[PDB]
Design brief:
The complex is a heterodimer of chains A (about 550) and B (about 425). Chain A is of the alpha+beta class. Chain A is elongated and about 105 Å long. The termini of chain A are far apart. The relative contact order of chain A is 0.07. Chain B contains ten helices and 16 strands. Chain B folds into four domains: about 130 residues, HIV Type 1 Reverse Transcriptase, Chain A, domain 1, CATH 3.10.10; about 80 residues, Alpha-Beta Plaits (2-Layer Sandwich); about 90 residues, Alpha-Beta Plaits (2-Layer Sandwich); about 110 residues, 2-Layer Sandwich (Alpha-Beta Plaits). Chain B has about 425 residues and is an alpha+beta fold. In chain B, the strands form five sheets. A five-stranded mixed sheet of chain B has the order 14-13-12-15-16. In chain B, strands 7-8-4-9 form a four-stranded antiparallel sheet. Classes of the chains: A alpha+beta (about 550), B alpha+beta (about 425). Chains A and B meet through helix 3, helix 8, helix 9, helix 11 and strand 23 of A and helix 1, helix 5, helix 6, strand 12 and helix 8 of B. The structure holds the ligand Cc1cc(C#N)cc(C)c1Oc1nc(NC2CCN(Cc3ccc(S(N)(=O)=O)cc3)CC2)nc2ccsc12, magnesium ion and sodium ion (NA). Magnesium ion (MG) binds next to strand 18 of chain A. Chain A: Heterodimer of p66 RT and p51 RT (RT p66/p51). Heterodimerization of RT is essential for DNA polymerase activity. The overall folding of the subdomains is similar in p66 RT and p51 RT but the spatial arrangements of the subdomains are dramatically different. Chain A: It is found in: Virion. Chain A: This is Reverse transcriptase/ribonuclease H.
Chain lengths: ~550, ~425
């Protein structure tokens, strides 16, 4: 007998106030009962469970299930009720490594820890809550009652406690073997190193030697799966990586659930397949929640999908990470608020790719979206590589300087350089900071009747130019924008505009280059064509000449 | 320090469960070294999966030092921690601190590590040192002693601190000492030469009565803190545009001050004149402008600090490295206004300038009222939350919200 260290128990509690489960055991056919008795007898011989007396008042139902070609009954303890009453745990397995952050490893071994899983004892004070009952034949004797001594499969705390127990056991081995890397996730231990296969096979042996100190038997993973390893949806190859094959289904009838899955594949694929777009396709699922509802594809959605198929023709792969090289991120504008990017160290060898879609909004511009793409890539890169990449952006240094020095908000982009790859992000208009000498001055106003929705918009200028246009089905805010639009339409290349509309100033001072309001868009198009525009605000109803005059002309 | 102080959360509130945000590799390595030493010293301990709570942690470099300092973001735990009246019904905030010619700020947070934390409360201080690329489970710790940045630390330690200061306070009856979170604010009216030594005097106390950053001293001069009243231009020739901006400014100021009138000035703008045309001021308009100018000299009326209400700080980017701000509880009743310029370290980084303005404004709020304001920041949330931890150098963290629509009133403080 070689003394083995005991695996430290994790103390467990039920949620405050709640009690253990008390679920009645279903009736079972005589066949299922016999099957369950044999299973539990073996489990008891192995120490996984133990018979209990009648004092225990808790109970969890147990079932017996059958398989396809394996002529077997399997045991099944339905811990759904007990899980609702078990405390929350720290789940240490939220995110998984991204292949683009990994470094190459000459050799990789895969161990199986499914049986060391059962060496993890369950907190003694908590076992009583795991009681279950095998009904007796014909209900003529008391049901055989058991409770678990180990982490039950399907119990709420088993994954976290097992993971934590393994990490604690492996801690010293990993720390005293800096030349290997150990990835534990699930019942698989994944060990890699840059050691020669022989010297690597010994580290593996020493790892068994170490795991044995807690009596953990761990042989090689049966049927060593040839490369690539199929893991978390990736194809991990020795020198390259990729998602498993992405096959876009061909269909004449596209339904809600089809387009969702189509975006999922396209999104999962956009991490290496460069240039994937998904607006139009994601657009088609605006609000519907009936996954069986069929939706016609806009001709802009067929063009987008056909563009995805072409990108999906030939598989693409990414390279692993080299900490001695630079980390570079390059961004391209795709249109319709869509952005694509590649992260690489050497040209033409992407670590990974990605995309960004603009946020919901009535008004926006390309520089704000580009800034948002940079922040997303920044945070993604800190997760994967622990550092910010150097950016290559399709915006002139001079454009950025003008933008941030004049923008009313604070804004910042990290170290970056211009890359001349059209379309370039630019500023489409810049308002004057001071009134323009020699430029005609337009005093604009609009107003609308809230009851009838009839309105007026127009202007009077210092040269005696005037216009009032009658409008239907409008509102105050629309007439205020229409007035500025009219002044832009009717003026020369340089113009001073005086408005009292705080609503219009709020929009224009946000410097949109595109809007979902056709009227704002028309104003942007006019601003683009001007040489100089000074926009001045005054308070309404204060006797400010011009303003007062035009306010009367439009208030009917 | 033997006996712990019984601490509990507020009724019907669980512990914090706040996600750890991603950290650069150099900050992770820094935290790994720091926490390894804290663990050897018994200040923190590894925790098991039965602890579901979490508070974010990052690393900073205090102003003018090269050593990484662990910074826990206890904001969630603080608002969930029971209100404290640890021995008395409350220590009155010293209204005289803001008047002292010089106030030096000491990082005395390390003193907290000598007091054990109530064993039942420790699980709520859980934090995670994250791994890069999710390649290993985060390193999980909880505090065994009063943590820096936690609301309860100064409260529980207040008894121990008062005694350490007694002799110093007994000897220097005119020096004002105020404690906020991990910081000690020490104001005197004597000159910096003896102030610096008198500050060192207080350090040795803390050093004999007991630090990685205690050697530092953040020097302030609140007596020289300048406010910003509303000013109107003084011109010999007014254009139409000048008068329009003036009437707009006075209309805004009339929400703050009574008796502001713009009738005579608006009277000058009769007609539809070119913006650049010069308009001579009538005698009626000049008098009106003079009466408004006089009104704006006097302070705002009925402005009082309500300790039960939040302080609100708004900030405007004025360009060229200049920033204006106003602190208030009710709109148009400013308790403090100010203006900053030439934020050193970032002539080409807006966000770093804004982060420094937030810290300086919070420092003024602590001195004047003893609490931090809720910020309205002129920045998009995603930009701010990506970068502010890179320039943060204070051991506390205020609350903030984001302004997405450009305020029209930026021009009025310009
Ligand atoms: C060890 C491990 C394996 C797998 C798999 N499946 C996944 C992860 C997340 C693992 O965990 C870590 N993986 C790495 N790097 C990678 C780099 C590339 N490969 C592909 C591979 C290499 C060699 C052969 S080969 N020629 O031996 O057949 C076959 C396949 C695996 C190792 N780095 C770390 C750092 C901390 S954990 C961790
Ligand atoms: Mg009007
Ligand atoms: Na355009």
């Amino acid at each position: 007998m070689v003394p083995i260290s005991p695996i430290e128990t994790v103390p467990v509690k039920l949620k405050p106030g709640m009690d253990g489960p008390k679920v009645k055991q279903w009736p079972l056919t005589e066949e299922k009962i016999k099957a369950l008795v044999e299973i539990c007898t073996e489990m008891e011989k192995e120490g996984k469970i133990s018979k209990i007396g009648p004092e225990n008042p808790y109970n969890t139902p147990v079932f017996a299930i059958k398989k396809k070609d394996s002529t077997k009954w399997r045991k099944l303890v339905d811990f759904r009720e007990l899980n609702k009453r078990t405390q929350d745990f720290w789940e240490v397995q939220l995110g998984i490594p991204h292949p683009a952050g990994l470094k190459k490893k000459k050799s990789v071994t895969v161990l199986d820890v499914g049986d060391a899983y059962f060496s993890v004892p369950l907190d003694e004070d908590f076992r009583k809550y795991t009681a279950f009952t095998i009904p007796s034949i014909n209900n003529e004797t008391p049901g055989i009652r058991y409770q678990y001594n180990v982490l039950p499969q399907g119990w709420k705390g088993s994954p976290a406690i097992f993971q934590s127990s393994m990490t604690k056991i492996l801690e010293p081995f990993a720390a005293q073997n800096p030349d290997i890397v150990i990835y534990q996730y699930m019942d698989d231990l994944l060990v890699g190193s840059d050691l020669e296969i022989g010297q690597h096979r010994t580290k593996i042996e020493e790892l068994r030697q170490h795991l044995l100190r807690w009596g953990l038997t761990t042989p090689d993973k049966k049927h060593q799966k040839e490369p690539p390893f199929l893991w978390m949806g990736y194809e991990l190859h020795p020198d390259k990586w990729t998602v498993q094959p992405i096959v876009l289904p061909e269909k004449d009838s596209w339904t809600v659930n089809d387009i969702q899955k189509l975006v999922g594949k396209l999104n999962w694929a956009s991490q290496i397949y460069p240039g994937i777009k998904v607006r139009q396709l994601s657009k088609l699922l605006r609000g519907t929640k009936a996954l069986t509802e069929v939706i016609p594809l806009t001709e802009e959605a067929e063009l987008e999908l056909a563009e995805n198929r072409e990108i999906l023709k030939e598989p693409v792969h990414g390279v692993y990470y080299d900490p001695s090289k630079d980390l570079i991120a390059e961004i391209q504008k795709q249109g319709q608020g869509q952005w694509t990017y590649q992260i690489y160290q050497e040209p033409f060898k992407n670590l990974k790719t990605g995309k960004y879609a603009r946020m919901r909004g009535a008004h926006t511009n390309d520089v704000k979206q580009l800034t948002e793409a940079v922040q997303k890539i920044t945070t993604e890169s800190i997760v994967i590589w622990g550092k910010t990449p150097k950016f290559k952006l399709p915006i002139q240094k001079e454009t950025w300087e003008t933008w941030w020095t004049e923008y009313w908000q604070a804004t910042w982009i990290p170290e970056w350089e211009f890359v001349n790859t059209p379309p370039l992000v630019k500023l489409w208009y810049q308002l004057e900071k001071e009134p323009i000498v020699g430029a005609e001055t337009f005093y604009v106003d609009g107003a609308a009747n809230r009851e009838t929705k009839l309105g007026k918009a127009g202007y009077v200028t210092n040269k005696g130019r005037q216009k009032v246009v009658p409008l239907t089905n409008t509102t105050n805010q629309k007439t205020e924008l229409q007035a500025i639009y009219l002044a832009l339409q009717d003026s020369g290349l340089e113009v001073n505009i005086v408005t009292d509309s705080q609503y219009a100033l709020g929009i224009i001072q946000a410097q949109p280059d595109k809007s979902e309001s056709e009227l704002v868009n028309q104003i942007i198009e006019q601003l683009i064509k001007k040489e100089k525009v000074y926009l001045a605000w005054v308070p309404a109803h204060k006797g400010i000449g011009g303003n007062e005059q035009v306010d009367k002309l439009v208030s009917a | 320090p033997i006996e712990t102080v019984p601490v509990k959360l507020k009724p019907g509130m669980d512990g914090p469960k706040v996600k750890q945000w991603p950290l650069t590799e150099e900050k992770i390595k820094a935290l790994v070294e720091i926490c390894t030493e804290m663990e050897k010293e018994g200040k923190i301990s590894k925790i098991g999966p039965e602890n579901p709570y979490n508070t974010p942690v990052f690393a900073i470099k205090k102003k003018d030092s090269t050593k990484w300092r662990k910074l826990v973001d206890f904001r969630e735990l603080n608002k969930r921690t029971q209100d404290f009246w640890e021995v008395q019904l409350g220590i009155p905030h010293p209204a005289g601190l803001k008047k002292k010619k010089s106030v030096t700020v000491l990082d005395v947070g390390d003193a907290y590590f000598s007091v054990p934390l109530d064993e039942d409360f420790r699980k709520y201080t859980a934090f995670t040192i994250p791994s890069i690329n999710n390649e290993t489970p985060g390193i999980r710790y909880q505090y065994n002693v009063l943590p820096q940045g936690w609301k309860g630390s100064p409260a529980i330690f207040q008894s121990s601190m008062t005694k350490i200061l007694e002799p110093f306070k007994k000897q220097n009856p005119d020096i004002v000492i105020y404690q906020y979170m991990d910081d000690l604010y020490v104001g005197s009216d004597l000159e910096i030469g003896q102030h610096r030594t008198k500050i060192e005097e207080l350090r040795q106390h803390l050093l004999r009565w007991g630090p990685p950053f205690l050697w530092m001293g953040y020097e302030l001069h609140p007596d020289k803190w300048t406010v910003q009243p509303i000013v109107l231009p003084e011109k010999d020739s007014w254009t139409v545009n000048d008068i329009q901006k003036l009437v707009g400014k006075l209309n805004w100021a009339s929400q703050i001050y009574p008796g502001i009138k713009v009738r005579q000035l608006s009277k000058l703008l009769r007609g539809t004149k070119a913006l650049t045309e010069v308009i001579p001021l009538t005698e009626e308009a000049e008098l009106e402008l003079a009466e408004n100018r006089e009104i704006l000299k006097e302070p705002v009326h009925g402005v009082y600090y309500d300790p039960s209400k939040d302080l609100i700080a708004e900030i405007q980017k004025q360009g060229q490295g200049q920033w204006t701000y106003q602190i208030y509880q009710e709109p148009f009743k400013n308790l403090k206004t100010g203006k900053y310029a030439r934020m050193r370290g970032a002539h080409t980084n807006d966000v770093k300038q804004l982060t420094e303005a937030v810290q300086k404004i919070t420092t003024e709020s602590i001195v004047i009222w003893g609490k931090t304001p809720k910020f309205k920041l002129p920045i998009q949330k995603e930009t701010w939350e990506t970068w502010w931890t890179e320039y943060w150098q204070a051991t506390w963290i205020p609350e903030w919200e984001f302004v997405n629509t450009p305020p029209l009133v930026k021009l009025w403080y310009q």
